[PDB]
Amino acid sequence: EGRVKNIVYLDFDGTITGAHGKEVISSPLCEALSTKATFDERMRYKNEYDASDNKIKITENAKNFLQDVNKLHPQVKIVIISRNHENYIKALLEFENIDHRNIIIYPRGVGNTIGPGEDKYKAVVSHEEKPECLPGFRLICDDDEVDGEEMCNGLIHTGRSQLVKFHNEKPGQFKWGEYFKEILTNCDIAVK
Numbered sequence: 001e002g003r004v005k006n007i008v009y010l011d012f013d014g015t016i017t018g019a020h021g022k023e024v025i026s027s028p029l030c031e032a033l034s035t036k037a038t039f040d041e042r043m044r045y046k047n048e049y050d051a052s053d054n055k056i057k058i059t060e061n062a063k064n065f066l067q068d069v070n071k072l073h074p075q076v077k078i079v080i081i082s083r084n085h086e087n088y089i090k091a092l093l094e095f096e097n098i099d100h101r102n103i104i105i106y107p108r109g110v111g112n113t114i115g116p117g118e119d120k121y122k123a124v125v126s127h128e129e130k131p132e133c134l135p136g137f138r139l140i141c142d143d144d145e146v147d148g149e150e151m152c153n154g155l156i157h158t159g160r161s162q163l164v165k166f167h168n169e170k171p172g173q174f175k176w177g178e179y180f181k182e183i184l185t186n187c188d189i190a191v192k
């Protein structure tokens with residue numbers, strides 16, 4: 001159909017995982033995975049991931065939420081915005097056997113190049129300005145209130161803020177089942 005009316009914008013670190021981005025970005029595992037650009041290279045780190053502190057993992061309820069929302073594709077789209085590395089995010093999704101083929105990731109840049117996930121306000125504005133994007137339901141989740149407000153401001157700037165649910169919880173405290181119900185009740189065509 002070529003139309004995207006409903007978008008779920010998710011921070012990664014501390015929102016999908018249990019650990020705030022500050023204590024993860026410089027961790028050995030994150031730095032090692034940063035340059036692993038294929039599934040084969042990333043999967044070598046699965047054993048270390050599974051042995052890691054539970055807090056760095058994608059949470060059980062966030063995994064279930066991503067898989068549930070994936071079933072609503074293409075009527076709902078998932079966008080992950082993050083100043084972490086694209087290969088770290090893809091690695092963790094793959095370690096959890098989460099299909100991310102349809103998830104859009106706006107991540108950190110490489111080296112001195114600035115990536116779209118480093119400016120969450122600009123990332124939301126740019127995504128909303130894509131030709132296929134239409135007004136509709138917006139879900140925004142972020143464990144960092146400042147970061148989450150920047151995504152909210154991107155919606156306001158583009159006139160896309162009239163039906164927004166913004167959730168700012170601490171890591172591990174997000175009510176993903178509640179937000180899935182928010183999606184179903186506010187996306188009528190997605191009811192099918």
Ligand SMILES: [Mg+2]
Pocket residue numbers: 011012013014015020021142143144
């Ligand atoms: Mg975060």
